[PDB]
């Protein structure tokens, strides 16, 4: 399975200056669950934005996507193509928005946490990527975090 | 990653002298999407409730579950033990009661729908089998049939 999880403002913003403008624990907990114990694919440019201890994240099959024939990332496998990535049974690709849209074509699942956030779409924002009527999800109710946004959990699936 | 995969109504039960005592439509598209081109293993007992003009479901691995080697299961696989027909990256258990309690140790995965129906036990009754204790799960809102009914979706996922 190939599925991508994410975490987008209402107007599909994921991330702004190489980093992301919201925290909600609730989710920093549902990313979890989710990836923990399986493989989670990221952008070269999300391995940074991630300080040294909080990486590589624990209990995971860490990998970057990068061009660079030499990047480091001391604990993770750096891959120049995404199907070299592909052999567990549960492979999460974890953002952003270059590698989301790269994977999307193998994707059948999509967990996304929507932040009831006006986050305008300005910068040389990162987005969320395009779900057309091929997939079919269950949208959530607001639940309220306890930074005092509002969000709700969606899971896009199709065969 | 081992699924479970099953509509129970809200006291559990989910089969009853070998039929499913509802309708509703949206189940079945949410049930095809989840399982379509993976395994598919069910109990003996609930490949015979299926008439032949339906089984085996198409583009999914049938296999069916029975203790006595030369059964026919015209179709599908007939093996002896549920780990014996465990073979994919993404195997869902379809039913009946009795092979999800089998194969419930295995599983990491539960896709839940909750039909609001008052139907209460009823000695003999095939029984959704039980969870909430170390199978975190994310809800969904109560959604509206067009056979009427009320049903939510739940997936759950073993921390
Ligand atoms: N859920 C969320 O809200 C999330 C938000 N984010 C945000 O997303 C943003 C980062 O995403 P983005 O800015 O799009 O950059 P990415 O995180 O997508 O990483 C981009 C890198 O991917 C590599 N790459 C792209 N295509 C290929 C390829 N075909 N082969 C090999 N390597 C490739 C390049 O690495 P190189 O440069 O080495 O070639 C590129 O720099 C940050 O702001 C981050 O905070 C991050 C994760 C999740
Ligand atoms: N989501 C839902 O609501 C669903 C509901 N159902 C309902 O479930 C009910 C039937 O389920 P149930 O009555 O529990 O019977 P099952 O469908 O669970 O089939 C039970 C059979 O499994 C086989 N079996 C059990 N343990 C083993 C083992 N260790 N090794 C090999 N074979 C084994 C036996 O087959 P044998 O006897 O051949 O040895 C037994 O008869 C029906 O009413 C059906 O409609 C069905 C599917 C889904
Ligand atoms: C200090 S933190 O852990 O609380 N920040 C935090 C928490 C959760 C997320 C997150 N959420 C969803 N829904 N999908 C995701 N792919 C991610 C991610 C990621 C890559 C590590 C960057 C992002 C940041
Ligand atoms: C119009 S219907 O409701 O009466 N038909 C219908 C009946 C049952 C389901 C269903 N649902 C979930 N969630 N799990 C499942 N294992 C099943 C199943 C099964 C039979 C083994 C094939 C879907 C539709
Ligand atoms: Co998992
Ligand atoms: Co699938």
């Avoid at 925290?23 to 990836?35: G, S």
């Avoid at 193509?81 to 492979?91: D, F, G, Q």
Wanted: aromatic share 8%; charged share 25%; net charge neutral.
């Amino acid at each position: 399975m190939v599925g991508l999880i994410w975490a987008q403002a209402t107007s599909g913003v994921i991330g702004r200056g190489g980093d992301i403008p919201w925290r909600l624990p609730e989710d920093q907990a549902h990313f979890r669950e989710i990836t923990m114990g399986h493989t989670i694919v990221m952008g070269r440019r999300t391995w940074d934005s991630l300080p040294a201890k909080v990486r590589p994240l624990p209990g995971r099959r860490n990998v970057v996507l990068s061009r660079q024939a030499d990047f480091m990332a001391s604990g993770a496998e750096v891959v120049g193509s995404l199907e070299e990535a592909l052999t567990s049974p549960e492979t999460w690709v974890i953002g952003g928005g270059q590698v989301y849209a790269l994977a999307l074509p193998y994707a059948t699942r999509c967990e996304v946490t929507e932040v009831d956030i006006g986050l305008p779409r300005e910068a040389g924002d990162a987005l969320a990527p395009v779900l057309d009527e091929t997939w079919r999800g269950e949208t959530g109710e607001w639940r309220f975090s306890r930074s005092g946004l509002r969000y709700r959990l969606y899971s896009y699936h199709r065969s």
